[PDB]
């Protein structure tokens, strides 16, 4: 149940990044897609959450990308 949630979230996270035009950065986008893919294929929460940390870090690393009030 928690596994479906984190996989569902990863799709949303990649979509948020996509609307932020991360596709404009070829190497970074490839990283994000790979992380997203491995999360969907993740068979244990330890692997899934660790990849989610890295994927989310891409979003948090972008200045002004996220309204700080939403955190």
């Amino acid at each position: 149940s928690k596994m479906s949630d984190v996989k569902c979230t990863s799709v949303v996270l990649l979509s948020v990044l996509q609307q932020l035009r991360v596709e404009s950065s070829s190497k970074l986008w490839a990283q994000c897609v790979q992380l997203h893919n491995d999360i969907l294929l993740a068979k244990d929460t330890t692997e899934a959450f660790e990849k989610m940390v890295s994927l989310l870090s891409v979003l948090l690393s972008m200045q002004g990308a996220v309204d700080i009030n939403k955190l």
């Binding site: 949303v12 948020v16 989610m52």
Partner: protein, 117 residues
Amino acid sequence: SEDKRAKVTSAMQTMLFTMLRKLDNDALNNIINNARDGCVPLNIIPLTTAAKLMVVIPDYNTYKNTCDGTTFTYASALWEIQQVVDADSKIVQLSEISMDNSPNLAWPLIVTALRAN
């Protein structure tokens, strides 16, 4: 629909963090919190010890919270600090970072580290 794309982006991001908060993962919760205080990754958080972590430290208070000795606590994990630089990209020794000496430092500081666990 130019303004509508913004509302959608805003709505999607609100749902995103709401979902994240529901997951209640310590690692995710940590980097989110730090990010709320201005402590944010400069680069993607490394998957393996091959790649290095770079995190922005906005103020001494954040440093004091996340740094003890050579150890840097981030994403509910420990990191061995390799190097620290200031806003002028000049190398800063850990012994320089202190309550008294912090006003003479150029903030923010960038911490480089490798995963210790």
